[PDB]
Amino acid sequence: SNKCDVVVVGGGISGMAAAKLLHDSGLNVVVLEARDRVGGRTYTLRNQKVKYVDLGGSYVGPTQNRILRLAKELGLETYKVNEVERLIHHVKGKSYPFRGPFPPVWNPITYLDHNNFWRTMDDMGREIPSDAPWKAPLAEEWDNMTMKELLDKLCWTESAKQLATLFVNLCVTAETHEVSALWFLWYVKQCGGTTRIISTTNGGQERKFVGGSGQVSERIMDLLGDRVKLERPVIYIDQTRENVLVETLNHEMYEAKYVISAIPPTLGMKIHFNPPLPMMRNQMITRVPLGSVIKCIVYYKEPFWRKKDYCGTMIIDGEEAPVAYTLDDTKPEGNYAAIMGFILAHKARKLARLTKEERLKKLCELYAKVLGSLEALEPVHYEEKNWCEEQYSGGCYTTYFPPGILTQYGRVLRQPVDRIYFAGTETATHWSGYMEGAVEAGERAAREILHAMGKIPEDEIWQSEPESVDVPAQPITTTFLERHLPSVPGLLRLIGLT
Amino acid sequence: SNKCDVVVVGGGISGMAAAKLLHDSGLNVVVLEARDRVGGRTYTLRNQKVKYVDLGGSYVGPTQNRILRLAKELGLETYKVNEVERLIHHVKGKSYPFRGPFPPVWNPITYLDHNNFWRTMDDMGREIPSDAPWKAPLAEEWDNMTMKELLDKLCWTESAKQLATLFVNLCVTAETHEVSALWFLWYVKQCGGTTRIISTTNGGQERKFVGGSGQVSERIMDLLGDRVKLERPVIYIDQTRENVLVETLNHEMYEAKYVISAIPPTLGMKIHFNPPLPMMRNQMITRVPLGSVIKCIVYYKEPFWRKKDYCGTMIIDGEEAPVAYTLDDTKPEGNYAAIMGFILAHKARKLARLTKEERLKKLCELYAKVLGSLEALEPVHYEEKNWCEEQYSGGCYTTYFPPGILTQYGRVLRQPVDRIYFAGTETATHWSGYMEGAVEAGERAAREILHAMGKIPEDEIWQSEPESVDVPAQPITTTFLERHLPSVPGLLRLI
Numbered sequence A: 001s002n003k004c005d006v007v008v009v010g011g012g013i014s015g016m017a018a019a020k021l022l023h024d025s026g027l028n029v030v031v032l033e034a035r036d037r038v039g040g041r042t043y044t045l046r047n048q049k050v051k052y053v054d055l056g057g058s059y060v061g062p063t064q065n066r067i068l069r070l071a072k073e074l075g076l077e078t079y080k081v082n083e084v085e086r087l088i089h090h091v092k093g094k095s096y097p098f099r100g101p102f103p104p105v106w107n108p109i110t111y112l113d114h115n116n117f118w119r120t121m122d123d124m125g126r127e128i129p130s131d132a133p134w135k136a137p138l139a140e141e142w143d144n145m146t147m148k149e150l151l152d153k154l155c156w157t158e159s160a161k162q163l164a165t166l167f168v169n170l171c172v173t174a175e176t177h178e179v180s181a182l183w184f185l186w187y188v189k190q191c192g193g194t195t196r197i198i199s200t201t202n203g204g205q206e207r208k209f210v211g212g213s214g215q216v217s218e219r220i221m222d223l224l225g226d227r228v229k230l231e232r233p234v235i236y237i238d239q240t241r242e243n244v245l246v247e248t249l250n251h252e253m254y255e256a257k258y259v260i261s262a263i264p265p266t267l268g269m270k271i272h273f274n275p276p277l278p279m280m281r282n283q284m285i286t287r288v289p290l291g292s293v294i295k296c297i298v299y300y301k302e303p304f305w306r307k308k309d310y311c312g313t314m315i316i317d318g319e320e321a322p323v324a325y326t327l328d329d330t331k332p333e334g335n336y337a338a339i340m341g342f343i344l345a346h347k348a349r350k351l352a353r354l355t356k357e358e359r360l361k362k363l364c365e366l367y368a369k370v371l372g373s374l375e376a377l378e379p380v381h382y383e384e385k386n387w388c389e390e391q392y393s394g395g396c397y398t399t400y401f402p403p404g405i406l407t408q409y410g411r412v413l414r415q416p417v418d419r420i421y422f423a424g425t426e427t428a429t430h431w432s433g434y435m436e437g438a439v440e441a442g443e444r445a446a447r448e449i450l451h452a453m454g455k456i457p458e459d460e461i462w463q464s465e466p467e468s469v470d471v472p473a474q475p476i477t478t479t480f481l482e483r484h485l486p487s488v489p490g491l492l493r494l495i496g497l498t
Numbered sequence B: 001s002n003k004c005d006v007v008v009v010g011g012g013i014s015g016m017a018a019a020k021l022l023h024d025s026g027l028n029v030v031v032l033e034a035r036d037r038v039g040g041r042t043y044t045l046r047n048q049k050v051k052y053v054d055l056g057g058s059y060v061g062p063t064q065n066r067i068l069r070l071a072k073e074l075g076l077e078t079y080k081v082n083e084v085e086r087l088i089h090h091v092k093g094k095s096y097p098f099r100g101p102f103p104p105v106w107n108p109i110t111y112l113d114h115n116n117f118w119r120t121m122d123d124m125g126r127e128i129p130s131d132a133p134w135k136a137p138l139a140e141e142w143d144n145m146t147m148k149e150l151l152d153k154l155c156w157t158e159s160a161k162q163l164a165t166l167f168v169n170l171c172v173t174a175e176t177h178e179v180s181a182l183w184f185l186w187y188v189k190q191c192g193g194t195t196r197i198i199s200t201t202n203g204g205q206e207r208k209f210v211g212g213s214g215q216v217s218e219r220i221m222d223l224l225g226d227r228v229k230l231e232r233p234v235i236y237i238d239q240t241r242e243n244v245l246v247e248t249l250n251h252e253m254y255e256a257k258y259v260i261s262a263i264p265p266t267l268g269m270k271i272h273f274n275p276p277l278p279m280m281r282n283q284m285i286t287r288v289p290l291g292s293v294i295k296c297i298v299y300y301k302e303p304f305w306r307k308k309d310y311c312g313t314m315i316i317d318g319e320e321a322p323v324a325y326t327l328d329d330t331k332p333e334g335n336y337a338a339i340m341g342f343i344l345a346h347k348a349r350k351l352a353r354l355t356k357e358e359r360l361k362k363l364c365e366l367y368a369k370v371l372g373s374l375e376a377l378e379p380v381h382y383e384e385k386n387w388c389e390e391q392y393s394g395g396c397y398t399t400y401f402p403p404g405i406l407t408q409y410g411r412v413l414r415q416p417v418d419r420i421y422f423a424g425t426e427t428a429t430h431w432s433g434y435m436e437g438a439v440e441a442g443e444r445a446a447r448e449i450l451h452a453m454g455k456i457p458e459d460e461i462w463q464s465e466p467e468s469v470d471v472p473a474q475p476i477t478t479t480f481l482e483r484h485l486p487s488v489p490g491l492l493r494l495i
C-alpha cells in the first residue's frame, strides 16, 4: 500500500487547491484522479484552429478573490470578455440592443413587474444564511416549492416570467420546475445576488484566463509532480482500521490518516464504503443531480458583430432557440473571432440527438437572425462539449437541489464522515458552483484536516480572502425608485385604496 | 475469469426471477449479490420471539399474478391480513371506526371534496399509458407539477388535503412536494387505481406469505446453488470486447454473453462503465432517488384490539404521529400478536436520531391513544428496520421521480445498453415498486436476452399471466353518486 498523510479524491480545482495547501504545509499528499487529465469540469482544448478554448468553466470576476489569488500565484493572467458594444435581448423574433446588465422594458406595468422580480429574489436572499440555507425563517415553505411555482406567484407579466425562466435555465442549467425555490434563492445570494451573478462588467462573467482555466489544475499538478495519479478512479474507502484504505479501479491501494472527497456529491455513489455511510449521506448522494449543458463555440474570420455595434452578448427567450445565451469568445489579441453559446437544460437533452454538423447549422441560423447578419452563416470552425456525457462529472455547471432536499439533507453536505472531509465547489459558502467555490471548499477541507491534526486552531478553518488588487469589486447599488416602486399587486392595492 | 451465458447483477426477487427463467431455459447463469444475503428490499428475520417477520416487502394481493405463481411454484402459501373488525381513522385527536376501504366523512362539503379527490386521481390515470407515462396527453403539464401543487389545486378542504397527503406519504414514502404529479398518477394507475392500491381486502395489502417473502429469493438461491455469489458487489462492467466483463469488489472477473442489471436504477452509479454509459442513462441514474421508511413491528401477548372490534388498521392524520399507518401483523394462528407501522418520509429522517427504545415508547403511546387501550403500553418484543441506512437499496419501497424527470428520462429505464438489459421492479408496467413488478421486470429482461439469442420470437418478450386460482380479483366498482356528485367548485359554479 502507498502510504501518505492525505488522499485527495479528484484532481479538479477543488482537489488540487486542497492538495497544494496540504503539500505547502509540509504534508504528504496523493491526488487520485479518475481521468487521464486534471481540471474536471474545467477543460482547455488546444489545437491549431482555436489555439486554446475553455469547453468547461471559464469566467471569473470581481469578489472571486480566492481563484484570482490562486491563479495569479501560478503565474496566470486574466483578460476582459468583450462588452464594449451593445448587448442584444431577442424576444418574440426581434432583437432589442441595450446597455447595462439588465435587459430593459418600456411598458410601465412590465417595468414594475421586472423591477419587483429582481428586487424580490434579493429580498428573499437576504433571509437565507450563506452557510446554512435551511435556517432561513421560511426555509420549509420555500424549499417545498419549485422555482416554477415561485415565478408563477411573483411575475404578473409573461415578459418578466420569460426572462426569469431564462435566468434560472442559464444560471443553474435546469428547468424552473426541476429546482427548489429555497436552493435557487440561496445559490443567487451566495454569489452576491442578482446583479453580481448576471453581470459581465462588474460580475461573474467579466474575465477569462489567458491560455484557459485548465492551467490552474495543470500548474498545481506540475508543483505536486508524481503525487497526482491519473486514471485512478476510486472504487472503495475503508475506515474500519487505524489508517484509511483507499482502493482505485486498477487495484492500487492507498493508506492515509485522512481523505478529502473533492468530487461532485452524487459521484460519491461510485465509491463502495466500509463501514456504510451514515443514513443521511447514504440518501443525500442519490438526491442531488447536476444540470445539463452543451457549451458550443462557433469560429468566424472576424468579430463582425462588433462592426454593427454588437459586443456578441445575446439573451434569446423562448423554446425554438437552441441557445438562450452567448458571449464574445474572441482572443484578447482580436483573433480567433468566436461566439460562445450554451444549449441549456432540456435543450441539451433534446438537441444531443443531432450530429455536430446539424447543431452548428442551427446555431449559425439563430445567430444570423439575432445579429441580422448573413456573415453568421460562414463559420470557419466549431468546438462543442456536451457535459451530460461525462461519467466523472455527471453534468455541469453544478449540483441542483430538487424541492424538499436542501432542508432535509443540506446539513450533511460538508459534515465529515469519520476521517473523510468534503471539498468540491458544491460545499462552498461563496460562489458555490464556480471555480471560486472549488478553491474555498478545497482550502477549507484541507484546514479542517490541519485542525484535526492539531497543526492550526479551530478559528483558522474558515479564512477570509484579501480582495484582488487586479480585479477590484464595484459595489452593487440600487436607485431610490428601484427600492420603492410598487410591485404590480402593490400598485393594484394603491388603486383600490383610492 | 469465470465464464457463463448471463451475469445477473442483484439477487433480489427481480434478479432471482430472471436467473431462474434463464436457468430453466438451459443457460449458465451467475447471480452477483453485493450483500451476505439475497432478497434485497425483502428481508425476513427469524427468532424465537417473532418466529418470522418481514422487515422489508411483505404484502401481495389480487391482480399480482406473477409473484403469486412464482411463490406457489417455490412451495409458498399465503394468509390474509386481518381485516375482520373495524378500521380506524384518527383525526384531530379522536378515533373514528369504519368499514370499507375509504375513510368516511360526514360534512357534505368535505364529502364532495374527498369523493372528487379519489375520482380525479383515477380520471387522470385513465389518460396515462402504463408502458409509457411520458405519452400521456398532458405529460409535460403533469410532470412539471409536484403532487403538493396538484393537491393544493384539487382539495378545497384541509380534511381532504390531510388524507390525500397521507395517501402519497404511505404509497411512495415521499413528501407530496418531492414527487412529480405525472409519476405519482402513473404509479397509482399501474397498480389498477386508488381502490386497488389502498385496499387490504381485494387490494395490494390482502395477503402475506406464510414464513416471510424472503423465502422467494432464498428458495431461488436454493435451486441455483453456488451460481449465486454472495458478497460480490459489482464495481466495473466492460463491453469493449467480444464477451462482457463484470468485475466484483473482491477482484473476481465474470465473462458473459449478456448482463441483466436487477438493481435500483440509481445504484447503477456504484458501477464504473467502459465504454461510458450513453448520456441519457449517465444523467438518469443521478435523478431517481428511493423513498424513506422505517418499518416497525410491536409485539403483544394477545391481539387485544380485536376485543374492541378493531382489526389493527390505523390511519393517523397529522405531523405529531410518528406512524401514519398500521396493519395487524398477527400470525394466522392468532399468535405472535403484533402491529406493523410505517414511519414515513421526513419522519423516517427525523425519528432516526432517537434510540430503538425511544421509537418503541413513541409507537406504544400512539397505539394506546388510537386503540384506546393501556394494553398497547405493554409490548413483549420490538423489531424495526430503517431502509434509509442501506448502501445496496438506497431506501424503500421504490424509486420516486421528482418533477420533470419522468418525461425527460423515463424512456431510458428499460432501454438496453449494448448487451446490458434492465430488470428491477422500477422497470415493470404493472405493480412497479412491488414484488409483483420485480417478477414482471426480471422475466421480461430474461426473455429480451432469449430473443437476442434467437431462442424466442419478439412477441414472447412480454407475456400475460393467468389469474391466480388462490387469490382471484373481484371487480373494482363505483356508485352512481360517486361517479356523478359534483366537486366543491362544481357545486359553487351551480351557485
Ligand SMILES: *Cc1cc2c(cc1C)nc1c(=O)[nH]c(=O)nc-1n2C[C@H](O)[C@H](O)[C@H](O)COP(=O)(O)OP(=O)(O)OC[C@H]1O[C@@H](n2cnc3c(N)ncnc32)[C@H](O)[C@@H]1O
Pocket: A009, A010, A011, A012, A013, A014, A015, A032, A033, A034, A035, A037, A038, A039, A040, A041, A042, A055, A056, A057, A058, A059, A060, A232, A233, A234, A235, A262, A263, A264, A267, A270, A271, A293, A295, A387, A392, A393, A395, A396, A397, A398, A423, A424, A425, A426, A433, A434, A435, A436, A438
Ligand atoms: C461544465 C461547466 C462548468 C462551468 C462552466 C461551464 C461549463 C460548461 N462555466 C463556469 C464559469 O464560467 N465560471 C466558473 O467559475 N465555473 C464554471 N463552471 C463550473 C466549474 O467548472 C466548476 O464549478 C468547477 O470546475 C468544479 O471544481 P471541483 O474541483 O469542485 O469539481 P470537478 O471539477 O468536477 O473535479 C472533480 C474531479 O474528480 C474526478 N473524479 C470523479 N469521480 C472520481 C472517482 N471516483 N475517483 C477519482 N476521481 C474522481 C473528476 O474526474 C474530476 O477531475
Ligand SMILES: *Cc1cc2c(cc1C)nc1c(=O)[nH]c(=O)nc-1n2C[C@H](O)[C@H](O)[C@H](O)COP(=O)(O)OP(=O)(O)OC[C@H]1O[C@@H](n2cnc3c(N)ncnc32)[C@H](O)[C@@H]1O
Pocket: B009, B010, B011, B012, B013, B014, B015, B032, B033, B034, B035, B037, B038, B039, B040, B041, B042, B055, B056, B057, B058, B059, B060, B232, B233, B234, B235, B262, B263, B264, B267, B270, B271, B293, B294, B295, B387, B392, B393, B395, B396, B397, B398, B423, B424, B425, B426, B433, B434, B435, B436, B438
Ligand atoms: C423496503 C420495503 C419495501 C417494500 C415494502 C416495505 C418496505 C419497508 N412493502 C412492500 C409490500 O408490502 N409489498 C410489495 O410487493 N413490495 C413492498 N416493498 C417493495 C419490494 O420489497 C420491492 O419492490 C422489491 O423487493 C424490489 O425487488 P428488486 O429485485 O427489483 O430489487 P431489490 O430487492 O433492491 O434487489 C436488488 C439487489 O441488488 C443488490 N445490489 C445492489 N447493488 C449491487 C451491486 N453493485 N452489485 C451486486 N448486487 C448489487 C442488492 O443488495 C439487492 O439484493
Ligand SMILES: O=C(/C=C/c1ccccc1)c1ccc(C(F)(F)F)cc1
Pocket: A059, A101, A102, A103, A166, A167, A170, A171, A197, A198, A199, A204, A205, A315, A397
Ligand atoms: O446567471 C448567469 C446569467 C444571467 C443572466 C444574464 C443576462 C440576462 C439575464 C440573466 C450566468 C451564470 C453563470 C454563467 C457561467 F458560469 F456559466 F458562465 C453564465 C451566466
Ligand SMILES: O=C(/C=C/c1ccccc1)c1ccc(C(F)(F)F)cc1
Pocket: B059, B101, B102, B103, B166, B167, B170, B171, B197, B198, B199, B204, B205, B315, B397
Ligand atoms: O397506498 C397504500 C394505502 C393507502 C391508504 C389506505 C387507507 C386510507 C388511505 C390511504 C399502501 C401502499 C403500499 C403499501 C405497502 F405494500 F408498501 F405496504 C401499503 C399501503
